């Protein structure tokens, strides 16, 4: 019930921390599941 939950969010001055799968799809953020559950770094010499 989109507008109801929205009304509730506004009146709470809520922050969407963007952790749920739904929220991340909304904002275009890579999902928190899966191959996304860790970071990759490169070992560089010199």
């Amino acid at each position: 019930t989109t507008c109801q939950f929205l009304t509730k969010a506004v009146l709470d001055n809520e922050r969407e921390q963007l952790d749920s799968p739904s929220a991340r799809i909304v904002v275009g953020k890579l999902n928190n599941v899966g191959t996304g559950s860790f970071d990759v770094l490169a070992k560089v010499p010199n």
Partner: protein, 105 residues
């Protein structure tokens, strides 16, 4: 890719300062100068800014109509689904404001 790439992937401007993706525009520059990306919310009408130190040249921008503005230069681009812009637009019709916190500051 599907949401990402098919879906409506869009590089869009945000104001890092007010966190909006709806109040940015390209400046309209004098001929010879280059256009920059500015926030209509975070900047003063030129007159009002004078009416309150010296004001640097890089801090003034203009629109097509011709009004001069001071400030609003804290913009970048973020990758969002286009439909987000539509949702934000509809919400502001209803008097509702989304504020995106962008990093790095």
């Amino acid at each position: 890719d599907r949401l990402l790439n098919s879906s409506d992937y869009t590089q869009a401007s945000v104001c890092r300062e007010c966190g909006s993706i709806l109040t940015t525009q390209q400046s309209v520059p004098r001929i010879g100068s280059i256009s920059t990306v500015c926030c209509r919310r975070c900047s003063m009408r030129f007159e009002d800014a004078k009416k309150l130190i010296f004001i640097d040249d890089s801090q003034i921008w203009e629109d097509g109509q011709g009004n001069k503005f001071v400030g609003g230069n804290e913009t970048t681009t973020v990758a969002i689904p286009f439909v987000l812009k539509y949702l934000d637009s509809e919400l502001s019709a209803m008097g509702i404001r989304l504020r995106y916190n962008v990093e790095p500051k």
